[PDB]
Amino acid sequence: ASVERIYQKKTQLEHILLRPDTYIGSVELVTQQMWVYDEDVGINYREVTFVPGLYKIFDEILVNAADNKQRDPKMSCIRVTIDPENNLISIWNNGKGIPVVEHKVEKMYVPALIFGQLLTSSNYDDDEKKVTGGRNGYGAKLCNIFSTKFTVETASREYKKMFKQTWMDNMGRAGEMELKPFNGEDYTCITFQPDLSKFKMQSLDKDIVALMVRRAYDIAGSTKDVKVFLNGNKLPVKGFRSYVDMYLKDKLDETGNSLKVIHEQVNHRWEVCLTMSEKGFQQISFVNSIATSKGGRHVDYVADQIVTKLVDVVKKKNAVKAHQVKNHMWIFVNALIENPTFDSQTKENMTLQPKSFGSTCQLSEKFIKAAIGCGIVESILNWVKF
Amino acid sequence: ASVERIYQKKTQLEHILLRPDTYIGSVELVTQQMWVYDEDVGINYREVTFVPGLYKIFDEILVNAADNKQRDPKMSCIRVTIDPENNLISIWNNGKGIPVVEHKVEKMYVPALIFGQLLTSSNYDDDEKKVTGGRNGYGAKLCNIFSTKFTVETASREYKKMFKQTWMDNMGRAGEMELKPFNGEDYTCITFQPDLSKFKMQSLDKDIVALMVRRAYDIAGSTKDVKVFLNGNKLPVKGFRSYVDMYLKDKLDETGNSLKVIHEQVNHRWEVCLTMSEKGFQQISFVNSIATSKGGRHVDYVADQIVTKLVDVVKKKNAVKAHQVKNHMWIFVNALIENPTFDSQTKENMTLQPKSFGSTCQLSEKFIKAAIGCGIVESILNWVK
């Protein structure tokens, strides 16, 4: 019971491994209903058992790839490989690579700096209003820390060089840096073997693969002008509306009627789909291709427009409250937000106030008119009649 | 557009001030309905405008004081002072002080280590199953980083010394360490001036004071055997049940009947109150005296017991879903959880699975039967019909 045993100081790396929850989410098993992509079945809603932290280190690299489309509009493809037997995940993107040159301040090559050193980012200057998902300078290093092997390969024609270096043992050591002359099409490829012992797992089982695959479909549905491949197979997704259809296709309410779906691409930064829900308020949303599974002010900003307008209709007739109207809604929101803020590194809840979004999302009078007639008002009027 | 301007590395301290959101919450104004204690009406539900990050650095020090009751059960009092004119907040507790001695490993005095160095804590050894709120070793340093002046004073009789040192300019520099002989009642007092420029605030206005005051009432209601004083005024709270009453005050539902309250202190680590909600599912919960404003598995663990039993009854008299039963519930939970986990440093959502709680909270059949007899089952049986 000595003072030095009671009061302890931890390094940054030690703290991440000792307290992973605020960095990557829970490292313990979770059992809950999720949307997944099952082989031969597609998008479906079922109970899944998985470790959030493992899902998240995959997500960090995948979002980083999508971020490059904002950095370089010439980027066109993301290629994802998932090899459960060899415990191997690879994420590849074209467009401009990372500059392969020595950082004059930190005195090391840039790819080694931003992948092997904590708190390193190109998103630290918020005078630039960016719609990338990267914000904090942790993501890629967290995947590195929770991998037994983590390899960065990036090629920059501008610098006429290609970079390749491997980290091992939870970013505890690095292999040899490979520099080669390069004069081809730029690319970046991140290949890592997740440290499954950190997650009390033995392999990338059916459930986590089904989640990682559905996440690849998310990227295909949330980005623009980006082809997404999964294990060499192109994913058949064209726009957010076709992605949303994969959830609603052939769904029926309890009475037997097909779900009425209201859609509007409000502008180049907002796309909204609205249908009816029988299990309370449901939302599926994305901010800068991040799956905001706890929602955020972008979801409230869209849903509160619909709720207030629907409440005004029930008030002409018939005492109703907004939460009663909201529990009949299932909304899909794909948004591009400038310099978003979140509650945590996992970025599941987007906290930025609408006045700082950098854009607006006023639903058309056509959308609202289609929403007053989607049966939500009918399901509220029959309740007041009781 | 040079490489060194594009790709930058930040120190831990720089990152906290540059990206405060994951550390303390939003540093921008928020307008939402909150429970506050106003100087003329008391506990009431109204719209408030405040900066979460400023509220949180107050919460970090306040929860630290409550943690000391777990460290030293002989501790009995917390005294909080809020002086808006001089921008001065102090949080004082009795019980055992911090050991005043040089840390043999980090080579500095213990209070200077755990208040002036990031990632320093007594809660890093999870072989000890503790029910304190502190987990990550950030809290006090974050308040320090977001203050223009931050002073730590703690007196340890065991070491017969008293410690006092001041940090200034967002923990950018530290004053002189003052060591004096001590032989009185142990205490710890944290006094800080919040850096209102970091929060774009001109003063500690009515709304942020009302929030800080209600939080002191939370501590008085969530802890055991702790008197809480605010500006020399004792808070009249004795136990969790009396605290919950301050919210309901015999107020009436939409029909005009007084709200029926079902209560059970299941054991020494769980106390639950259940009434009726007319605005959807409401929860007011605490884990190790932390206000878990986003809920967590401690709330699900309690609420789902009620939901499962109420669903079992409506099926006997008949298609029902769990969310419809839950949207009529307003639940209060005061829980002590071993080594809890949360989504973020703000600890608003408690993520630990029930199998790691260190205790159980199985509601008595009397409590369940008392829940079967509220209007929740009645308001649902007629709807399915």
Ligand SMILES: Nc1ncnc2c1ncn2[C@@H]1O[C@H](COP(=O)(O)OP(=O)(O)NP(=O)(O)O)[C@@H](O)[C@H]1O
């Ligand atoms: N696929 C990629 N192509 C090009 N640059 C990349 C790629 N992935 C990462 N980077 C760069 O590497 C930096 C570090 O990535 P990362 O550690 O994820 O931090 P971040 O994305 O900026 N912020 P965050 O993910 O919120 O912690 C990024 O800021 C980019 O500049």
Ligand SMILES: Nc1ncnc2c1ncn2[C@@H]1O[C@H](COP(=O)(O)OP(=O)(O)NP(=O)(O)O)[C@@H](O)[C@H]1O
């Ligand atoms: N009022 C107090 N009385 C006694 N010890 C205290 C007091 N406040 C803080 N401490 C000690 O100082 C340490 C540092 O506090 P803090 O920075 O808040 O980290 P923490 O409470 O351990 N975890 P967290 O608050 O979740 O980041 C605590 O672990 C306690 O051991």
Ligand SMILES: CCCc1cc(=O)oc2c(C(=O)N3CCCc4ccccc43)c(OCCO)ccc12
């Ligand atoms: C700890 C994991 C957090 C998470 C990540 C994720 O990736 O997905 C999730 C989904 C989900 O499967 N989806 C579908 C597509 C992407 C998305 C954005 C927002 C909300 C939900 C979802 C979900 O489902 C709840 C029932 O609906 C619940 C949670 C998640």
Ligand SMILES: CCCc1cc(=O)oc2c(C(=O)N3CCCc4ccccc43)c(OCCO)ccc12
């Ligand atoms: C960013 C601020 C987070 C927060 C801190 C806090 O301190 O309070 C809150 C309350 C609140 O006022 N209370 C009452 C007492 C303590 C508590 C525990 C859990 C939940 C809620 C609350 C609240 O209200 C929601 C509508 O009810 C909503 C949020 C908070």
Ligand SMILES: [Cl-]
């Ligand atoms: Cl978040």
Ligand SMILES: [Cl-]
């Ligand atoms: Cl949290």
Ligand SMILES: [Mg+2]
């Ligand atoms: Mg990133």
Ligand SMILES: [Mg+2]
């Ligand atoms: Mg603390």
